Amino acid sequence: KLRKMLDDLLVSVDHSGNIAVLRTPPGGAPFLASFIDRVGMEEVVGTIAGDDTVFVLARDPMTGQELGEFLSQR
Amino acid sequence: KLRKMLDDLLVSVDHSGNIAVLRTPPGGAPFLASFIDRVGMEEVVGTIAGDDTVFVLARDPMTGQELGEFLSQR
Amino acid sequence: KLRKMLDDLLVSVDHSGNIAVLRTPPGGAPFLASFIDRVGMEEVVGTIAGDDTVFVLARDPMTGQELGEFLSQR
Amino acid sequence: GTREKLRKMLDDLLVSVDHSGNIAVLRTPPGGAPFLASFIDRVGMEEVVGTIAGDDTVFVLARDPMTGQELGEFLSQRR
Amino acid sequence: GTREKLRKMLDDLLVSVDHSGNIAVLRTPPGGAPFLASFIDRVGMEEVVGTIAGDDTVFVLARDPMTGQELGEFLSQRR
Amino acid sequence: GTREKLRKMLDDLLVSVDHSGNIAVLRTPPGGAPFLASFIDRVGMEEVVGTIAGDDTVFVLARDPMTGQELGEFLSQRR
Numbered sequence: 209k210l211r212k213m214l215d216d217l218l219v220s221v222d223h224s225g226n227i228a229v230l231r232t233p234p235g236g237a238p239f240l241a242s243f244i245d246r247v248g249m250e251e252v253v254g255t256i257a258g259d260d261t262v263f264v265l266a267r268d269p270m271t272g273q274e275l276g277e278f279l280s281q282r
Numbered sequence: 283k284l285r286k287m288l289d290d291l292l293v294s295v296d297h298s299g300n301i302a303v304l305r306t307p308p309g310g311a312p313f314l315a316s317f318i319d320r321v322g323m324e325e326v327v328g329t330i331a332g333d334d335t336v337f338v339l340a341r342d343p344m345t346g347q348e349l350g351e352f353l354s355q356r
Numbered sequence: 357k358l359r360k361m362l363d364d365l366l367v368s369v370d371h372s373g374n375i376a377v378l379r380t381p382p383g384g385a386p387f388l389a390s391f392i393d394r395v396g397m398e399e400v401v402g403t404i405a406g407d408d409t410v411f412v413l414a415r416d417p418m419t420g421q422e423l424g425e426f427l428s429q430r
Numbered sequence: 431g432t433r434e435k436l437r438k439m440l441d442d443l444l445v446s447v448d449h450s451g452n453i454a455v456l457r458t459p460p461g462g463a464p465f466l467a468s469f470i471d472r473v474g475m476e477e478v479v480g481t482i483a484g485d486d487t488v489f490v491l492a493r494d495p496m497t498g499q500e501l502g503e504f505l506s507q508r509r
Numbered sequence: 510g511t512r513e514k515l516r517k518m519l520d521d522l523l524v525s526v527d528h529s530g531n532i533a534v535l536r537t538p539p540g541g542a543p544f545l546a547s548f549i550d551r552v553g554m555e556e557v558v559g560t561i562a563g564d565d566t567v568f569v570l571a572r573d574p575m576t577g578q579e580l581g582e583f584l585s586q587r588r
Numbered sequence: 589g590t591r592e593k594l595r596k597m598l599d600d601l602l603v604s605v606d607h608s609g610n611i612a613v614l615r616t617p618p619g620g621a622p623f624l625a626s627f628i629d630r631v632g633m634e635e636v637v638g639t640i641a642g643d644d645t646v647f648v649l650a651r652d653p654m655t656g657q658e659l660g661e662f663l664s665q666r667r
């Protein structure tokens with residue numbers, strides 16, 4: 209469950225333009241991001257995970273702030 | 283040849299705003315992206331590869347959709 | 357010091373839209389990016405590092421060009 | 431606390447443990463290896479010389495004379 | 510099919526093979542190591558305890574009593 | 589020049605060196621392991637079979653019969 213992953217891994221959410229930024233604990237980004245990819249959300253154009261940072265690309269016309277609010281809401 | 287790399291590695295292309303998103307098979311993103319970097323395309327501001335996802339940043343005024351169409355066309 | 361890291365690691369800076377792109381020597385991206393993260397700059401929404409490429413997301417209304425100019429200026 | 435945290439990390443991320451020679455091999459779910467390995471590093475195991483995470487695999491190097499197997503067992507007992 | 514795919518992977522990604530002790534070391538082109546290693550994991554080699562990919566290098570741990578060299582040879586013969 | 593560059597790399601990135609068996613283990617600051625390891629690869633050490641970088645850790649495999657320790661010492665002497 210993404211909801212469960214998000215309580216353990218989502219340290220914070222931020223945004224700018226079409227991107228939602230998710231912060232995780234150290235090394236957490238690929239574990240969280242690949243789980244997002246498996247959910248298969250239509251508004252999620254794609255994700256890239258660094259070490260502690262995920263960039264999630266929102267499908268126009270959704271903004272990165274809206275997208276990040278939906279992930280933070282879970 | 284990028285054309286050849288793209289038939290073996292490009293599972294799909296997507297976009298939003300100034301970003302083209304390329305999906306690859308598992309672990310394929312850095313192999314595909316670094317090969318894009320070596321091509322040296324003026325409209326490609328840069329790329330970042332995750333595991334199975336490449337973000338390619340299009341130079342304004344080109345959009346991520348146009349850029350992704352040119353890569354998908356190869 | 358970020359200033360010192362930037363002379364050793366910043367090969368070039370580029371931009372498009374809300375993103376500043378930093379190029380590093382091979383494998384340098386996570387070393388440079390995590391150091392940016394530790395600085396904690398309010399306009400930096402987040403960073404993701406690939407191998408030789410950092411994407412830095414600028415907080416609206418700052419552009420990726422302005423942000424990249426401030427990093428290049430250090 | 432650190433121990434309760436390690437135990438929960440291991441329970442949620444450690445799919446299996448294996449070994450060969452002085453290496454213990456941890457398997458995780460997809461993307462999980464840096465998350466798990468980062469934390470292991472942070473607990474400060476004297477018997478661990480170091481770790482490297484891939485995507486779903488960690489190699490944990492055992493400090494001589496300990497073996498990869500013994501390392502693995504130590505970790506399994508923390509679950 | 511899996512074998513034809515492994516063979517093509519190896520032909521296109523394996524620049525060289527080397528070894529030391531219980532480790533086989535695969536070299537790839539730039540960025541190629543996770544692509545190759547992911548696939549190796551997926552073929553299910555019983556003689557492989559696990560793999561870790563860097564950027565252009567994979568370490569493949571051989572299951573005791575097999576050696577890194579023997580592993581390498583097995584892989585070379587699949588090309 | 590390559591040597592002055594290696595020396596500066598090592599001085600700035602090598603927090604510590606350790607070993608077990610045929611592996612030398614390099615510790616770096618955060619994110620530093622691919623930067624350091626890339627460069628090591630590029631200097632062409634005959635005694636190095638290969639390297640893999642994580643985030644803050646590199647495993648350097650020593651070419652038989654050299655040991656992880658001896659490798660480490662060689663690198664320490666370049667600082």
Ligand SMILES: N[C@@H](Cc1ccc(O)cc1)C(=O)O
Pocket residue numbers: 237257258259260261385386387389390393402403404405406618619643
């Ligand atoms: N936040 C960036 C930079 C980073 C890289 C390595 C780290 O250990 C920490 C941060 C990323 O996750 O890609």
Ligand SMILES: N[C@@H](Cc1ccc(O)cc1)C(=O)O
Pocket residue numbers: 237238239241242245254255256257258311331332333334335460461485
């Ligand atoms: N698509 C993201 C997340 C991801 C990370 C690890 C994976 O194994 C799979 C997907 C990326 O490539 O960075």
Ligand SMILES: N[C@@H](Cc1ccc(O)cc1)C(=O)O
Pocket residue numbers: 311312313315316319328329330331332385405406407408409539540564
């Ligand atoms: N520039 C991209 C692609 C890349 C990946 C692996 C490399 O070795 C080089 C480049 C990134 O840094 O993610």
Ligand SMILES: N[C@@H](Cc1ccc(O)cc1)C(=O)O
Pocket residue numbers: 308309333463483484485486487488542543544546547550559560561562563
């Ligand atoms: N098991 C290897 C190879 C791998 C790479 C990428 C993957 O998505 C999956 C597996 C590692 O974790 O490095």
Ligand SMILES: N[C@@H](Cc1ccc(O)cc1)C(=O)O
Pocket residue numbers: 382383407542562563564565566567621622623625626629638639640641642
């Ligand atoms: N060979 C090592 C170090 C390396 C890191 C990044 C590179 O781009 C190249 C080499 C690895 O694959 O981890």
Ligand SMILES: N[C@@H](Cc1ccc(O)cc1)C(=O)O
Pocket residue numbers: 234235259463464465467468471480481482483484621641642643644645646
């Ligand atoms: N030391 C391990 C685990 C690790 C992963 C991510 C980190 O940010 C820190 C440590 C490695 O370098 O792979």
